[PDB]
């Protein structure tokens, strides 16, 4: 038995809690916790991304962003959630509106939670840019303007930054490496790998190696469309992982 | 990507919210909604029932009961959740302690939310009684004393009570009909069906008919261990149904 008809779903339940805290104009631990739960259960889980978008999660995100402009952990959690949505190629058309693109581009300059909001926003836009110039449609602002802002953001992040993010797999990022359609997307992805193997080598060097990252990084150095700063980062990641493989190998 | 390494589950995330509200000493809309969510997602989902028990659900239940003695909707939601746990035979041993049995038995006299708390407690005990007397172990109160309070609670409910509960299927209640181990469990189940077809026939008459309840109620009319008032109610259920 239960109180009412129907079966409640995890995503929609968290969104109902969000709705209530927004009405109360209170971004407390319940608010931030619910968005973190959404971020967590959309990790590698496209069906939960659909449920978020289909129960009007985008309006809840925009309204929360407007009402709580200085709640830094909230912004991180929301943009991490949207990073998971943006990984799903068939859901990206719903992100291609002037309203949404303008917000993601603005957040590239955010200083909230260190670099996490600018990074997560830059990831959302990296998957979008991956789709190519003709995917922009009638979106404003100019694709070039957003692309220039993405470069600026990435180069501004301390490569040794401590992080509030976890990856179980690098495959969504690795898919951004073997292409010349969007070098800025390739650059964000290489930076993301370089930061994580630099600061957390024991956590992420094995992941990157196991998932085939080494030949993908070598292919970056070979392609004529990759920028020199990207090639240089790629060489450093390769160097770090090869040392790590030697240091961690059981040669007995 | 995500903040932490682990994977968050629905049941455990609701219990975390409940634990925070207990610390805050606040039983507000979110506290009650979280328990309603648990009640909802444990409906015929024994995996979610086990997850509730494995992550300290029974302690959080007791803590909430003691901290918020007049929150009637909270008590209803908590006991409905426990009613779903009690439907899972493998899990019922965890409810067989003097601490829990005494709570369920005391709650038979609760007047919280009309009859819902007393009804949900009686349902918990009905599935427990169904397992028979050797499953009681040596818990106190005595099995027979709890039985008498169950009979008295069912008798005290108005048959035309409007209800704050919903059933998608009657199968766990129907399983209490064809047995002689616990006539009081059979009596609770028949009352449950009688109230619902009396008050909400358009919803529950077709459900009861579809799931084969009519032969089961005819079986009760002719069953040697069924008490006389159980057979009477069964006849009336068949009446409301064959008229529908």
For residues B75, B79, B81, B84, the Cα torsion angle rounded to the nearest 10 degrees is -170
- The verdict on residue A1 lying in a domain is no
Q: What is the sign, positive or negative, of the torsion defined by CA atoms of B28, B34, B35, B37?
A: positive
Neighbours of A25 (CB within 10 A): 8
The alpha helices in chain B, defined as continuous H runs, are 10-24, 29-41, 46-54, 57-67, 72-86, 98-107, 116-130, 143-156, 171-174, 183-199, 201-210, 213-221, 228-243
Q: Give how many domains chain A has, as a whole number.
A: 1
What tokens were used for B63?
A: 């803590």
What does each C-alpha distance from B111 to A72, B26, B78 come to in angstroms?
46, 22, 15
Q: Measured between alpha carbons, how far apart are the two ends of chain B, in Å?
A: 55
* Contact assessment for residue B127 and residue B176, using Cβ atoms and an 8 Å cutoff: yes
Determine, yes or no, domain membership for B2: no
Instruction: Identify the experimental approach.
Output: X-ray
- With CB atoms and an 8 Å threshold, state whether B7 touches A40: yes
Phi, psi at residue A136, to the nearest 5°? -70, -25
Q: Are A50 and A91 in contact (CB under 8 A)?
A: yes
A120, exposed or middle or buried, with CB in 10 Å at 0-12, 13-18, 19+? buried
> What is the rounded distance in angstroms from the CA atom of residue A186 to the CA atom of residue A174?
9
Closest CA to A114 of A165, A146, A161, A159: A161
Closest CA to A89 of A179, A172, A190: A172
Most B-contacting residue of A2, A10, A76, A170 (CB-CB within 10 A), to test interface: A2
| Residue with token string 């006539």 | B183
Cβ contact A40–B2 (<8 Å): yes
Positive or negative: CA dihedral A122, A128, A134, A136: negative
SS3 A166: strand
The CA–CA distances, whole Å, from B67 to B32, B61, B64, B74, B75 equal 14, 10, 5, 11, 11
Partner-chain contact B20 A37, CB within 8 Å = no
CA distance B132 to B143: 10
Tokens of B26: 């606040």
Contacts of A6 in chain B (CB under 8 A): 40
- Could B80 and A16 be called an inter-chain contact, meaning their C-beta atoms sit closer than 8 Å? no
The angstrom resolution of this structure is: 2.0
Dihedral (CA of B210, B169, B96, B89) sign? positive
Q: What is the DSSP letter of B131?
A: T
Instruction: Give the span between the Cα atoms of A117 and A108, in whole angstroms.
Output: 7
- Is residue B14 within 8 Å of B38, Cβ to Cβ? yes
> Are residues A165 and B1, on separate chains, in Cβ contact within 8 Å?
yes
Put simply, the answer to whether A40 touches B80 (Cβ < 8 Å) is no
Chain A CB contacts of B8 below 8 Å:
37, 40-41
**Residue A4 domain-assigned (yes or no):** no
- Which residue matches tokens 């009760």? B220
What CATH number does the domain containing A102 carry? Answer: 1.25.10.10
The two tokens of residue A168 are 């179980």
Nearest-angstrom CA–CA distance, B10 and B12 = 6
Instruction: Round to whole Å and give the CA distance between B20 and A29.
Output: 9
The encoded tokens of residue A91 equal 């859901």
Decide if A120 contacts A76 (C-beta within 8 A).
yes
DSSP H helical segments within chain A, as ranges? 10-23, 29-41, 46-54, 57-67, 72-86, 98-107, 116-130, 143-156, 171-174, 183-199, 201-210, 213-222, 228-248
> Does residue B10 contact residue B55 with C-beta atoms inside 8 Å?
no
Distance CA B91, CA A7 (A): 22
B161 SS3 class:
coil
- Report the residue count for chain A: 252
Containing structural domain, residue B38: 10-243
Which two three-digit tokens encode residue B229?
């008032």
Distances in Å between the Cα of A171 and the Cα atoms of A3, A175, B85 are 42, 6, 40
Residue A5 lies in a domain: no
Q: Which residues of B touch A72 (CB under 8 A)?
A: none
Q: How far is B8 from chain A (nearest CA, A)?
A: 7
> By three-state DSSP, how is residue A2 classified?
strand
Residue B28 lies in a domain: yes
Rg (CA), chain A: 19
Q: After which residue numbers is chain A interrupted with C–N beyond 2.5 angstroms?
A: none
Spatial separation of the C-alpha atoms in residues A238 and A32, rounded to whole Å? 37
d(CA B76, CA B78): 6
């Amino acid at each position: 038995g239960k109180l009412h008809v129907g079966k409640m779903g995890f995503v929609v339940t968290m969104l109902k809690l969000i709705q209530k805290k927004l009405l109360d104009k209170t971004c407390d631990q319940v608010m931030e916790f619910s968005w973190s739960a959404l971020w967590n259960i959309t990790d590698e889980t496209p069906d939960n991304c659909e449920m978020f978008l289909n129960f009007n999660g985008m309006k809840l995100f925009l309204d929360c962003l407007k009402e709580f402009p200085e709640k830094q952990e909230l912004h991180r959690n929301m943009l991490g959630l949207l990073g998971n949505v943006a990984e799903v190629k068939e859901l990206r058309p719903q992100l291609m509106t002037s309203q949404f693109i303008s917000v993601f581009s603005n957040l590239l300059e955010s200083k909230a939670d260190g670099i996490e909001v600018s990074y997560n926003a830059c990831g959302v836009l990296s998957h979008i840019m991956f789709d190519g110039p003709e995917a922009w449609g009638v979106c404003e602002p100019q694709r070039e303007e957003v692309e220039e802002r993405m470069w600026a953001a990435i180069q501004s992040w301390d490569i040794n930054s401590r992080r509030n993010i976890n990856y179980r797999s690098f495959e969504p990022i690795l898919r951004l490496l073997p292409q010349g359609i969007s070098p800025v997307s390739q650059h964000w992805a290489t930076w993301a790998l370089y930061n994580l193997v630099s600061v957390y080598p024991d956590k992420y060097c094995p992941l990157l190696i196991k998932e085939g990252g080494m030949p993908l990084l070598r292919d970056i150095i070979k392609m004529a469309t990759a920028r020199q700063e990207t090639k240089e980062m790629a060489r450093k990641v390769i160097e770090h992982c090869s040392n790590f493989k030697e240091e961690n190998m059981d040669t007995s």
